[PDB]
Amino acid sequence: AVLYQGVNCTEVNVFQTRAGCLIGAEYVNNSYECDIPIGAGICASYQSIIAYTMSLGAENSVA
Amino acid sequence: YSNNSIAIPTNFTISVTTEILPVSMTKTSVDCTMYICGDSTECSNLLLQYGSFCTQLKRALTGIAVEQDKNTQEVFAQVKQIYKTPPIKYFGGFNFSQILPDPSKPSKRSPIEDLLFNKVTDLICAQKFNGLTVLPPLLTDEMIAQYTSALLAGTITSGWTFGAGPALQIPFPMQMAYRFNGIGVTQNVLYENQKLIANQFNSAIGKIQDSLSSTPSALGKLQDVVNHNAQALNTLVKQLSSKFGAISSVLNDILSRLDPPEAEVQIDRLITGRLQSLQTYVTQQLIRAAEIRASANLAATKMSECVLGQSKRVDFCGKGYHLMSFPQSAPHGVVFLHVTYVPAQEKNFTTAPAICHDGKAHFPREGVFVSNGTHWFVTQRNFYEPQIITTDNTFVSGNCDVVIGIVNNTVYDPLQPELDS
Amino acid sequence: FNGLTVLPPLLTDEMIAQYTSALLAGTITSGWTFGAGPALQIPFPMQMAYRFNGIGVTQNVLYENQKLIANQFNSAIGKIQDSLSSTPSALGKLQDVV
Amino acid sequence: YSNNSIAIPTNFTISVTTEILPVSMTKTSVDCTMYICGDSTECSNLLLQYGSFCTQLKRALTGIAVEQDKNTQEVFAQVKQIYKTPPIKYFGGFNFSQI
Amino acid sequence: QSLQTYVTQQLIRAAEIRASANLAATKMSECVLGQSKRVDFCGKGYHLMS
Ligand SMILES: *[C@@H]1O[C@H](CO)[C@@H](O[C@@H]2O[C@H](CO)[C@@H](O)[C@H](O)[C@H]2NC(C)=O)[C@H](O)[C@H]1NC(C)=O
Ligand SMILES: *[C@@H]1O[C@H](CO)[C@@H](O[C@@H]2O[C@H](CO)[C@@H](O)[C@H](O)[C@H]2NC(C)=O)[C@H](O)[C@H]1NC(C)=O
Ligand SMILES: *[C@@H]1O[C@H](CO)[C@@H](O[C@@H]2O[C@H](CO)[C@@H](O)[C@H](O)[C@H]2NC(C)=O)[C@H](O)[C@H]1NC(C)=O
Ligand SMILES: *[C@@H]1O[C@H](CO)[C@@H](O[C@@H]2O[C@H](CO)[C@@H](O)[C@H](O)[C@H]2NC(C)=O)[C@H](O)[C@H]1NC(C)=O
Ligand SMILES: *[C@@H]1O[C@H](CO)[C@@H](O[C@@H]2O[C@H](CO)[C@@H](O)[C@H](O)[C@H]2NC(C)=O)[C@H](O)[C@H]1NC(C)=O
Ligand SMILES: *[C@@H]1O[C@H](CO)[C@@H](O[C@@H]2O[C@H](CO)[C@@H](O)[C@H](O)[C@H]2NC(C)=O)[C@H](O)[C@H]1NC(C)=O
Ligand SMILES: *[C@@H]1O[C@H](CO)[C@@H](O[C@@H]2O[C@H](CO)[C@@H](O)[C@H](O)[C@H]2NC(C)=O)[C@H](O)[C@H]1NC(C)=O
Ligand SMILES: *[C@@H]1O[C@H](CO)[C@@H](O)[C@H](O)[C@H]1NC(C)=O
Ligand SMILES: *[C@@H]1O[C@H](CO)[C@@H](O)[C@H](O)[C@H]1NC(C)=O
């Protein structure tokens, strides 16, 4: 999957990120640990290739 | 100074100080061929003769780019669990509104974090269109804010236990008593003066906010980093306008005006000059990256030792005796709020090394012998709390003659009325 | 001659010496209190007893052996002065910088 | 080493050691044009084609020069009060003449 | 080229000296103004003062 840095998606599975235009990857709402860092909070991984928002960590509410 | 005089504080001041440390710089990336030659292909062919300089520059810039994200992750992502503050924001009278996240703000940032963000601020396109690109940070600002909120909630609810293992809850006054025992003052001092300490803490927090708001030079370091980066980029762009020993500084005119045999000479002057400029840019970038990496390591150590625990190192976590710290996020850096214990209102006494009684010398277990002029007592070193000399707080070692400057006095025995009655 | 100039330091040697003397006086008379707040005076034997307690030795050890400790400290000071005087490579780093 | 034995010190020695640390280097500033060309005007004219090299060198040297003073200030100026020793230099037998 | 070489060496030595000065400041704050429990930080043996 190719990423066009700093170029809007209208000038070139299409996803728009702050880093640029990402082609060939599908966005998934689920959060995981970062496998391949892309930038601006988006990470990519292979499971086809998916793009997701990286998860900071498991939530733990202390009582 | 004297020979038989000592001074003991009869009060304390809870002071909060700020420390600003840069963490990461702007991630930049260059395109060697586009900068050096632009559209023209003959220049690119000539540029190829000089070897793998462009590859070296690209590799170095990539190294700095990944190092920035590594620095940010090291400084902030120190807890694998994110904690949340309890819904009821009562902690025994202590106020944390100024540092806790504000739900009203869409950015979910504390008021101090918002103030810090606000105080730090066709050139951009001029830089971008020439082959220079800035890259977005991996961690967005809200993610850094979330990390800081998690650390702050952990250090409020659990003290220092969450840093060294599982999180164990502790009521805030009891954590206060633990941290007071850390600096050598007993718990009753805190427990009796809880309201005064809470009021002092709140006043210090308010003063910190006002001081940050009303001083322009407080955040000089981060603004200096931003200015250095922008100035270096602008200087690099300006170098394209220099003739550099050629007849024209624009390559297209040289190509369109002149024959190839001397056109090559002109493009060689331009190529070697632009290579020199690019190498200079890379070398200063590397040096600045090393400096900022050292700063980031210092910030990470400060976080681990002052925020996640109590530190005994002098002046490492603020002026005075250290109590805790609170982290706050800032653009390209982190701001610490060191809470320290400062003695005040000292009062001046007469002291002796040991007390001679029944031919035996008595020495304080943990305190010191003070005398207000007619009577002798034992007090803690860091706070004045007179107490009757007994056998509980004193230990016996040898006779009176060995020590120099011993002073006679009676030693009360707690058991004496017990077996007397 | 050739356009290179050395600029004077902002702090002259006398004022640096004054700073060092101030630090020495503070640590001699008031122990470590002056670092963390207002200066509180302490007789030097008592400060020595405190610092002995810092390393895990009780105060009576300092108090009963005061003269021996003082003599050892004075002998050490004389020895360090002689060692600095008699060795040329002791100050290698500063001279190397120059 | 053993299973049920220990060694306990019975006596001590007060030791004094040195440690030398450089703090600042000599502040130096250069004049780019005077060095590169001297008093010749034509050399200065040709130097001008290269542009902001001299400015960059002067800026770097100025940064180093201010950093030296900052280093000295950080190392030494850590107390805001100028304390003074008492006139009588008696401290229980401890002798501080050499320092 | 000669001037740039001089400036680069000066910058590297400045980084050297800045690291040394930071170490010296830490040593001052932790050994002179207080008593340190760090091993060998303030001299060989158990530290008393500096
Ligand atoms: C110790 O100092 C505190 C202040 O740090 C004193 O408390 C103040 O008392 C006055 C009069 O009682 C009030 O007007 C102030 O508002 C108090 N301070 C605060 C922050 O509220 C206290 O009286 C002092 N105690 C001793 C024994 O000296
Ligand atoms: C904690 O401090 C905050 C601010 O320091 C207090 O909020 C203030 O409340 C008063 C009256 O309710 C308002 O007039 C102010 O405008 C508030 N300040 C801000 C910044 O919003 C708050 O009352 C204090 N106590 C608690 C329990 O939160
Ligand atoms: C305890 O006693 C000493 C000696 O009497 C006090 O030292 C004096 O303080 C005043 C106030 O500034 C000075 O004008 C004198 O010169 C000091 N004496 C000497 C010999 O220098 C000391 O201040 C007292 N402690 C307190 C807390 O007042
Ligand atoms: C030193 O402190 C002691 C203990 O507080 C004082 O002894 C008490 O003093 C008060 C007022 O002077 C009397 O009402 C008590 O009866 C005293 N108690 C005893 C057991 O004697 C002493 O007066 C103080 N000395 C000075 C000079 O202030
Ligand atoms: C502290 O008390 C001891 C014992 O009461 C004193 O030692 C006595 O001092 C008197 C007067 O000099 C002599 O007549 C006795 O022979 C001493 N007895 C012993 C066993 O030595 C001592 O002088 C007192 N110290 C002070 C400073 O008053
Ligand atoms: C501990 O060591 C000191 C010396 O480091 C010993 O003091 C010496 O004692 C002898 C005989 O008593 C004298 O000749 C020396 O002059 C002393 N040295 C100094 C520096 O004064 C001391 O005796 C030792 N303690 C024990 C219990 O052995
Ligand atoms: C403190 O140390 C100094 C020097 O180490 C001692 O001064 C010496 O005194 C003797 C006898 O008066 C002279 O022979 C030496 O020449 C002095 N040395 C110097 C360098 O002047 C001093 O006696 C020691 N004790 C005191 C209390 O000052
Ligand atoms: C105690 O202090 C005074 C004043 O500094 C001094 O003159 C006196 O000699 C000292 N005591 C002894 C026994 O030396
Ligand atoms: C005592 O030491 C010996 C050898 O050093 C070892 O075999 C033995 O197990 C030790 N004693 C006990 C009770 O373990």
Task: Write the DSSP string, C19-42.
Answer: HHHHHHHHHHHSTTTTTSSS----
Report the separation in Å between the CA atom of B395 and the middle of ligand 5, taken as the mean of its atom positions: 21
The answer to whether B54 touches B33, Cβ cutoff 8 Å, is yes
Distance of CA A31 to the CA centre of its chain: 10
**Pairs across B and E, CB distance < 8 A:** 21
- Which pair of tokens denotes residue B263? 């056109």
From the list E11, E34, E36, the residue facing B287 with the nearest CB is E11
β-strands B355-357, B407-408 pairing:
parallel
Distance of CA D64 to the CA centre of its chain: 12
User: How far is Cα B244 from Cα B254, in angstroms, rounded to an integer?
Assistant: 13
Determine the straight-line distance between the first and last CA of chain C, rounded to whole angstroms.
20
How was this structure obtained?
A: cryo-EM
The answer to whether B314 touches E33, Cβ cutoff 8 Å, is yes
Kindly report the number of other CB atoms within 10 A of residue B75's CB atom.
27
Residue B152, C-beta contacts closer than 8 angstroms, at least 6 positions apart = B85, B96, B99, B100, B326, B327
- Which pair of tokens denotes residue B197? 């300490």
Asked whether the CA dihedral B362, B363, B365, B369 is positive or negative, the reply is positive
Determine the straight-line distance between the first and last CA of chain B, rounded to whole angstroms.
47
**Cβ of residue B276 lying under 6 Å from some atom of ligand 5:** no
User: How far is Cα E2 from Cα D36, in angstroms, rounded to an integer?
Assistant: 10
User: How far is Cα B12 from Cα B326, in angstroms, rounded to an integer?
Assistant: 21
**Element housing B417 (H / E):** helix B415-420
User: How far is Cα E36 from Cα B142, in angstroms, rounded to an integer?
Assistant: 39
Kindly report the number of other CB atoms within 10 A of residue D4's CB atom.
4
Q: Do A37 and B138 touch (CB under 8 A)?
A: yes
Residue B78, C-beta contacts closer than 8 angstroms, at least 6 positions apart = B151, B300, B303, B304, B308
Q: C50: left (phi > 0), else alpha (psi -120 to 50), else beta?
A: alpha
- Which pair of tokens denotes residue B370? 């003070």
* Ligand located closest to D88 CA: 8
Annotated resolution, angstroms: 3.7
User: How far is Cα B354 from Cα B375, in angstroms, rounded to an integer?
Assistant: 14
Asked if B239 is an interface residue toward chain D (Cβ–Cβ < 8 A), one would say yes
Kindly report the number of other CB atoms within 10 A of residue B225's CB atom.
23
CA distances to B36, B60, B135 from B54, rounded to whole Å, are 10, 10, 19
Kindly report the number of other CB atoms within 10 A of residue B316's CB atom.
16
Residue E7, C-beta contacts closer than 8 angstroms, at least 6 positions apart = D57, D60, D61
Among B141, B166, B163, B140, CA closest to B151: B163
**What is the edge-to-edge ordering of all strands in the sheet holding A14-16?**
A2-5, A20-23, A14-16
Asked if E7 is an interface residue toward chain B (Cβ–Cβ < 8 A), one would say no
Q: Which of B315, B317, B340, B382 to mutate to test the interface with E (most CBs of E within 10 A)?
A: B315
Kindly report the number of other CB atoms within 10 A of residue B301's CB atom.
12
In this structure, what DSSP letter does residue B403 have? S
Among D60, E1, D26, CA closest to B287: D60
Residue D24, C-beta contacts closer than 8 angstroms, at least 6 positions apart = C9, D68, D69, D71, D72, E17, E21
Residues with CB under 6 A from ligand 1: B 10-11, 196, 199-200, 345
Compute φ and ψ for B27, nearest 5 degrees: -75, 115
Q: Do C42 and B346 touch (CB under 8 A)?
A: no
User: How far is Cα B70 from Cα B66, in angstroms, rounded to an integer?
Assistant: 6
Give the CA-trace dihedral at C39, B325, D23, D56, to 10 degrees. -140
- B354-E33-B204 Cα angle (round to 5): 100
Among B320, B6, B54, B338, CA closest to B205: B338
- Which pair of tokens denotes residue B79? 């807890």
Long-range Cβ contacts of B90-97 (<8 Å, 24+ apart) = B91/B156, B91/B172, B92/B171, B92/B172, B92/B173, B92/B176, B92/B194, B92/B198, B93/B194, B93/B195, B93/B198, B94/B172, B94/B198, B94/B201, B94/B202, B95/B198, B95/B201, B95/B202, B95/B205, B96/B152, B96/B156
Q: Do E32 and C23 touch (CB under 8 A)?
A: yes
Long-range Cβ contacts of C58-61 (<8 Å, 24+ apart) = C58/B363, C58/B395, C58/B397, C59/B353, C59/B363, C59/B364, C60/B361, C60/B363, C60/B397, C60/B398, C60/B403
Write out chain A residues lying below 8 Å of B141, CB-based.
Answer: none
User: How far is Cα B254 from Cα B39, in angstroms, rounded to an integer?
Assistant: 13
**Element housing B226 (H / E):** helix B220-238
CA distances to B4, B8, B9, C70 from B382, rounded to whole Å, are 18, 7, 6, 27
Q: B345: left (phi > 0), else alpha (psi -120 to 50), else beta?
A: left
